[PDB]
Every structure is written in structure tokens, then in C-alpha cells.
Amino acid sequence: AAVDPDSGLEHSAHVLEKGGKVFSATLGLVDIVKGTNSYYKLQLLWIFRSWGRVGTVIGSNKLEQMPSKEDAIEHFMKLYEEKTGNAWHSKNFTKYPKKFYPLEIDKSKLPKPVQDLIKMIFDVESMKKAMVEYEIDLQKMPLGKLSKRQIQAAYSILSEVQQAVSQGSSDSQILDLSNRFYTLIPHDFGMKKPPLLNNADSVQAKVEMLDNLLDIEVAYSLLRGGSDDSSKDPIDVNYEKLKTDIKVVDRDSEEAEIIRKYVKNTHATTHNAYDLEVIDIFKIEREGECQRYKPFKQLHNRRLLWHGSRTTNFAGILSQGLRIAPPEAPVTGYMFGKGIYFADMVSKSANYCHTSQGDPIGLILLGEVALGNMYELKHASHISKLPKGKHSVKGLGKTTPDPSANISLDGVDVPLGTGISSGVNDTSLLYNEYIVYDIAQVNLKYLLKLKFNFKT
């Protein structure tokens, strides 16, 4: 990391490191019962100490010049151990009672709609606002990159909470994990106590947070880099970083009429809170997504299906394709375990865009997903391994698009019929879900841009 500007000597003297270990640590301590939720940043520029309640004006600091440089190590490692409990070097860290815990820090030639697409998916201040509702610390999280091993442990804590919640474990068991999580990921609750992770959807909410937070740091990783040479334009630099060939499907096109039909037709009768309106259609072609999908063009039963996600995620979805949840993450929220989920209805997928009356525009995908021999399920069931000969899973719903009106498209079955009753009604799903447990089975075809019209 760099120098903290609270010292006032940020662009004057560099932060020091002895060979490998960088003399700079950002500590944290939270007790849900007491309500305390504090930070403690220590640095060696001069030694600098910062402290207070995370996400508020509560706190203070002390910049202090040293007599010498060897006295700095003495003052630093002493203050460290006094506050954290451990020594500066260690094989594995161990938390101590009421001591702190250290957090692991690390002229454009394109169409106007394509420029707006980059404008939409690379505006990171819009992604910052998106995290404000989650109550993630807004102050120093953009400049302070939280580690990968750290976030995996944060995922693991959430998965431990769901396990604890499922079999009605002790309050202390839950209290610990709630403490552990908020220490590991600094939240901003202001002057009130951190809430306990006791619900089944509270972990899901914090699981969703980590998924979104990850993609913002990924969006930064793309934006920060490349070769800054005076030749290409700023928007073109960010386009090449996406590693995809995007094209604008014209409104006069015959294939464009199929998508607008697929949007208009497959709107849910129950999801009447908003009304869709297709602003644009983009044909999308990822780098080497056809090379990996060649295997599954042999596979039968291929369907063109919807898949929605936050506008913040589309920065990463283009660069890495659709990814399955990590093995550390909790299975809560998922109906049939971790995998890529798809729907035959635009509305059901469109809810995952997360739009409001203030933020109307949103993005939704259409991917040729090779389902193949399907494993059909009625009720929710967290699966680990698929049955023999099955390449996908299907969640059977009440309403299904008319199978006698299934139009084809480049050798792909597009179910753009309106809703009718299904074959079986002993299910706990209202609409269909299509699940693949391999990132190779998906092949993204179209990206849409949709305006939402509410009534308020």
C-alpha cells in the first residue's frame, strides 16, 4: 500500500519495507455485544498511528518523528504486538482476546451504442454507490485492495453461518462467525451495533455482497493496466480489455425482431411491477468461447435462454465469461447448487439486473446453453454430482412457454411462446430454471439493454 494522507506527508517520504515484509498494517476489531467496531492503521514512513470507529468522524491520529531508523523498528514492532498480540513475523496468525486482527491488504472509432455500453459497464463510481446499500466501507476500499485469500475466508465464514443456522447451533457459535466476518470485511453501520448473521437470507445478502464486491475489484483490474501509448483512444483501450467482439444488431434486422418478440412474449404474469423496453440489441462474441464450445455442438437439445445480472458484473462477465460460484462460497440462494442459472422468460432473468425508478437502464444476456440430456427436478434439492448420462438440470415450473411455438435460430431452439400450464403441477417453482455445472456448456450470443417502466 501507499502512504495515508492523514499524516500530511504523503507526497514527501515513501513508506518503508525491509526486503520483503512491508512495514504497514491495517488492523480491525469488532464486538457485536459491546457495539464496538473499530480500525487501527499503523505505518512506518516517522511512525504513523491512525485509529477510530470505521466509517465515521469518531477517532484521531498521531504522526510522530523518530530519533533514528533502528528506533523505528523498535517502536513499530512494539506497538504492533501491543495492539495485535502477535509478533511481526509468523507462520500462521492467531487472534487474541480483545486484541486486534490484521487485515490482508495487497477520435475513437466505434459505434455510439458500443461507447455507451463501455460508459455504462466501466463507470466505477456507479459501482461504488451500488455497494453503499450493502454497508461496505466506502472510504478506503477502492484504493485498498482486499486480498484474495482474505475474501475466500470471508466466504468460508458465511458458509459456516448457514451450516450453524441450518442445524440450530449455539448463539455463541453464531456470535463468533458474525464477529469474525465484520472484522475480516470492514462495514459502516455508523453509530449503531453490527447486526447478527442469524437469518438464512442475511448470509445470502452478504454472499451477494462479496460476489458484487469481487467484480468491482475485477473491473478495476481491467481498467488499471495495458500499454499507455499515444495512439488509441480512451474508450478503445477499455474495449480491447473486455476481450470480446461486440456488434450492434440493427433494428431493421429480421433476427432482431425475434429477440424483441422473445422479450415481449415471455414477460411474467406475476412480475407486473415493471414494463420492459428494448433500447438496444448487441451480438456478443467472446475470445475463444467458440473454441471451448465446439465439444457441445455435438450435444443435442441446445436452447437460447435468458440470464440477467447486475450492470456492475457485466465488466467481468465479458472478460471471463459466465463463471460458477467458488467452492468456499455458501450454497444459500441457489435452488440446485452452484452453477450457471438460466431462464426461458426475460422477466425472471430481468429481476437480477437490479434496477429502480432512479436507475432505469439495465443489461440482460442471451446464451446458447447446451442442456443435452436433462435431469428434471420439481422441488429444491442441493446436488453435488449429476446422475449418470445427465449433462444439465431443469427446474420444472407451473408456467412454460408454448412448446408447440418453439422457433429455431441458427440451429438453436428459442422458446419464445407465451405462458401455458406445464405437464406436472406438484412442483415448488412457478417458472422454469435451466442449470449447467460447467462453464464450457454456455456460449453467449446476445447482450440486451433494457429500460424499465414502473408505476409510482
Binding site: 464486538d31 455485544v33 464496538t36 467496531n37 473499530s38 485509529w51 477510530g52 470507529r53 468522524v57 469518531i58 477517532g59 484521531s60 492467531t94 487472534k95 487474541y96 482476546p97 480483545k98 455463541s172 456470535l175 463468533d176 464477529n179 469474525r180 472484522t183 453509530m191
Partner: protein, 222 residues
């Protein structure tokens, strides 16, 4: 936990928020807990007991609202209770309990300032260590636990966390650590404890124990 706080001045150093003069040592003073601008934690705003009631604060029931009320001396509790404002068997057990509650209050207080007269802090520290007790921080708190130890008994370790239980207002709260991240939350009115063993070194133990002290358990407020 509580908004307000009352005690005898632990030092004649802190000033009074209203009049801004030094609150003298061992004097009845009241506080109001506020959020410190300088760090993540509550801080007491100490007042002179006289000055406390002119700021406009009106504690309806001191015993349930103000912290450290039960730890005060009995006659001083009544001063706070009065100044705050400005059937046969039922009333008998009710009235006879308040008789026994005063009996227990000023029994410990007689024992407390008896040890303050005869023993130094290091004697009281090594008293607790001999009985396998955690030595607390503070002068007032040390003889408070020694007096608790002698009258009722040497507190045995906690069931799960193996920490030290401590009397706090209305119960014995565990102050140990169930884990490194979280503090233990064991609470009880009837804790486990063996008998208090005074070492041989006590030439005034026969005088202190001669103050009509028999076997009895901790009595609590209603």
C-alpha cells in the same frame, strides 16, 4: 451498558462538567456516558453530585437506570433515591428483606474499609492469588473482590471457558473468553465456589472475622 453511572471518586483528579472544578477523591459523584470524539468507545461525563441535578436530567428510578447503585453504601443509596424525586405476609417478607439487604450492604462496607485500615494493596493482591483468583485492575475493585471472597467464598473457575466470574450489580458475570474473538456471556446468581482460605499470615483476621459473620449467600435486589 447503562446511560448513567454513580460511584465514589476513584481519584480527586477529574473535573466537573457543569462548574469545572476538581471533584475530590472518595466523594459521591454521578456521570452520564457519552460517545468520545477521539476514539471508538463510551466515556463518562463526571458531575459533582450537587451539580448533577441542575443540568436538567431526571432519573425516575436510580436503582434500575444508574450503574453502580448497588455497590454504594446503604445511606448514600437513599440520598440518590430521595434526590432523584427532588398483604400481611407479603409486606413482612418485603420489609424484612430490606432489613437483611442493609445488613449485607454495610457488612461488606465494614469489612472493606477494615482491610483498607490494616492491609496494603500488595497484601490484598496476594490474598486473591492464594485463593486462585484473578487480580483485578484498580484499588477499589481489589478490596471489593476480597470482601466478596471472604464473606461468600472463593469463586471456582467457569464451567466452559474456565475464566473468572465477577459480581456486577445484580449477578455474577463471567469475564473469561469462550474464544479469542468473543467474550464469554455466562451469568448467574448462584455460582460455584469453595470456601475462602486465608493464609496463616493474619494477626488481625481474628478481629475482622469477629464481626458477627456467619455462613450466608449473596442477597440480590428485587
Amino acid at each position: 451498558d447503562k446511560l448513567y453511572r454513580v460511584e465514589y471518586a476513584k481519584s480527586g483528579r477529574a473535573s466537573c462538567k457543569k462548574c469545572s472544578e476538581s471533584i475530590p477523591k472518595d466523594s459521591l459523584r454521578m456521570a452520564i456516558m457519552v460517545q468520545s470524539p477521539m476514539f471508538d468507545g463510551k466515556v463518562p461525563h463526571w458531575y459533582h453530585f450537587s451539580c448533577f441535578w441542575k443540568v436538567g436530567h431526571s432519573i425516575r428510578h436510580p436503582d434500575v437506570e444508574v450503574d453502580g447503585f448497588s455497590e454504594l453504601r446503604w445511606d448514600d443509596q437513599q440520598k440518590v433515591k430521595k434526590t432523584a424525586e427532588a398483604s400481611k405476609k407479603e409486606k413482612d417478607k418485603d420489609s424484612k428483606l430490606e432489613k437483611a439487604l442493609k445488613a449485607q450492604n454495610d457488612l461488606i462496607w465494614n469489612i472493606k474499609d477494615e482491610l483498607k485500615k490494616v492491609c496494603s494493596t500488595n497484601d490484598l493482591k496476594e490474598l486473591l492469588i492464594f485463593n486462585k483468583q484473578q487480580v483485578p485492575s484498580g484499588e477499589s475493585a481489589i478490596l471489593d473482590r476480597v470482601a466478596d471472597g471472604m464473606v461468600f467464598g472463593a469463586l471456582l473457575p467457569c464451567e466452559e471457558c474456565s475464566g473468572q466470574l465477577v459480581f456486577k450489580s445484580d449477578a455474577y458475570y463471567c469475564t473469561g473468553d469462550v474464544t479469542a474473538w468473543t467474550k464469554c456471556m455466562v451469568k448467574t446468581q448462584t455460582p460455584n465456589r469453595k470456601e475462602w482460605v486465608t493464609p496463616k499470615e493474619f494477626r488481625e483476621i481474628s478481629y475482622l472475622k469477629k464481626l458477627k459473620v456467619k455462613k450466608q449467600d449473596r442477597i440480590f435486589p428485587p
